[PDB]
Structures are given as structure tokens and as C-alpha cells.
Amino acid sequence: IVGGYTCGANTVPYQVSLNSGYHFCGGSLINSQWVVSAAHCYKSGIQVRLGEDNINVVEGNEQFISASKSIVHPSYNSNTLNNDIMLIKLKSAASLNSRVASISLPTSCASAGTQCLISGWGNTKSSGTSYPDVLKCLKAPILSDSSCKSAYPGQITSNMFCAGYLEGGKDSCQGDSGGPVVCSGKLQGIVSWGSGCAQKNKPGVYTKVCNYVSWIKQTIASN
Numbered sequence: 001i002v003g004g005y006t007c008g009a010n011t012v013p014y015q016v017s018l019n020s021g022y023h024f025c026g027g028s029l030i031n032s033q034w035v036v037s038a039a040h041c042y043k044s045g046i047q048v049r050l051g052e053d054n055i056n057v058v059e060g061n062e063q064f065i066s067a068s069k070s071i072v073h074p075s076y077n078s079n080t081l082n083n084d085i086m087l088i089k090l091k092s093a094a095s096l097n098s099r100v101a102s103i104s105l106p107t108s109c110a111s112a113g114t115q116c117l118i119s120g121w122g123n124t125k126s127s128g129t130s131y132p133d134v135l136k137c138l139k140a141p142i143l144s145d146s147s148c149k150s151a152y153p154g155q156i157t158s159n160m161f162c163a164g165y166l167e168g169g170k171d172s173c174q175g176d177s178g179g180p181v182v183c184s185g186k187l188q189g190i191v192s193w194g195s196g197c198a199q200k201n202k203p204g205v206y207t208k209v210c211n212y213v214s215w216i217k218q219t220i221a222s223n
């Protein structure tokens with residue numbers, strides 16, 4: 001996250017870190033046994049890490065649970081990033097508490113102008129690289145479909161939305177991928193892509209979770 005603030009330990013209780021020897025992506029806990037992330041985060045050997053503050057320190061509220069399976073969306077296209085969503089199942093259910101908690105799926109798609117919370121452990125620099133180790137947060141509005149398409153000609157599908165600031169300076173970044181965009185207490189987006197980070201006229205692009213609620217529910221019900 002570039003231009004954000006330190007969230008505070010365990011203040012984003014649905015935020016998970018995906019670890020394969022190291023943190024490589026975020027995710028969102030949507031029930032005691034399932035995480036939503038980005039399809040472009042898929043790999044072998046995933047451990048889901050819940051209750052994290054500093055991802056380099058065991059502070060006392062963590063739960064580390066290996067994945068039993070993951071399910072990339074059937075229509076994910078890695079060239080266009082259309083349908084950039086996957087589900088990850090935990091081998092055992094997490095123990096839910098005030099610091100490890102699920103986030104609800106949306107009932108309705110959120111509108112341009114709605115304020116959301118974007119969070120992650122990704123790079124905090126638009127030029128160069130620095131990883132923060134503690135969770136960073138950014139409050140940002142959803143942008144109009146028109147603004148989003150104008151920023152990225154030929155690239156925005158009906159399964160994507162932009163959020164952030166056209167002026168620059170405040171955005172998600174590398175290492176935030178797969179993490180949450182929460183608006184009014186519901187998971188509306190997944191950190192997906194953008195050109196650089198926090199560049200003028202290049203806002204963040206997010207997977208539009210409301211389009212996937214039926215797929216998520218039906219997949220969980222049978223897996």
C-alpha cells in the first residue's frame with residue numbers, strides 16, 4: 001500500500017497472508033474454512049496465516065493453517081486478468097474470535113463514490129521498494145466505470161472496477177494482490193492489477209466480487 005496508514009494490530013480481522021515460505025499475496029477470510037484471493041496468486045504449497053500483525057513476528061494471535069485445495073475461477077484469463085478470483089480451503093477450520101473473523105460477501109454491487117478500505121503488506125513505494133511488515137490501510141473511493149475505462153483503454157471488463165485517486169500518491173501495490181477491498185462492511189473487491197503503483201491517471205484495478213457471489217456460494221457448498 002502506497003500512501004496509506006498503519007492499520008493497527010488485528011484491526012482488519014479478515015485479512016490473511018498467504019505464505020509459501022514467505023508472504024506472497026493477501027486474501028480475505030469469508031468463513032471459518034475458506035479464503036478469497038486473486039487467481040493470479042495461485043501456486044502450490046499455500047499456508048494461510050490468520051491473525052497477523054507483523055508478518056515477520058509471532059505475536060500471539062496467529063493461526064497458521066495449510067490449504068487443502070484451491071479453486072481458480074473457471075474463466076480466469078491470466079493475460080487479461082479477467083475473472084481474477086480464486087478460493088482457498090483450509091485443512092482445518094480457523095477458530096473465530098475478535099481478531100480472526102470472516103467478512104461477509106456483498107448483497108449488492110457497490111457504486112462509484114462509495115468509500116472502501118484496502119489493506120495489505122505490500123510495497124509502500126511508487127519508486128523503488130520497501131515492505132512494511134505490519135499491515136497498511138488505505139481509504140479510497142470506487143471510481144466511475146467511465147473514469148476507469150478512460151484510464152485503461154481496452155482493458156477494463158465488466159468484472160473489474162477502479163478505486164483510488166487519479167492524482168496519484170495513494171494506491172495498492174505489489175504484494176497486496178489478493179487482498180480485500182471492503183465497503184460498508186462487505187467484501188466488494190480483490191486487489192488485482194494496475195500500472196505501477198500510485199501513478200497519476202493509473203488507479204488500482206480490483207476484481208468485482210459481487211459478480212461472483214453465486215459461484216463462491218455454490219463452490220463452497222460442494223467442496
Ligand SMILES: NC(=[NH2+])N1CCCCC1
Pocket residue numbers: 171172173174175176177191192193194195196197198203204205
Ligand atoms: N493497484 C495497483 N497499482 N496494483 C495492484 C497490485 C499489484 C501492483 C499493481
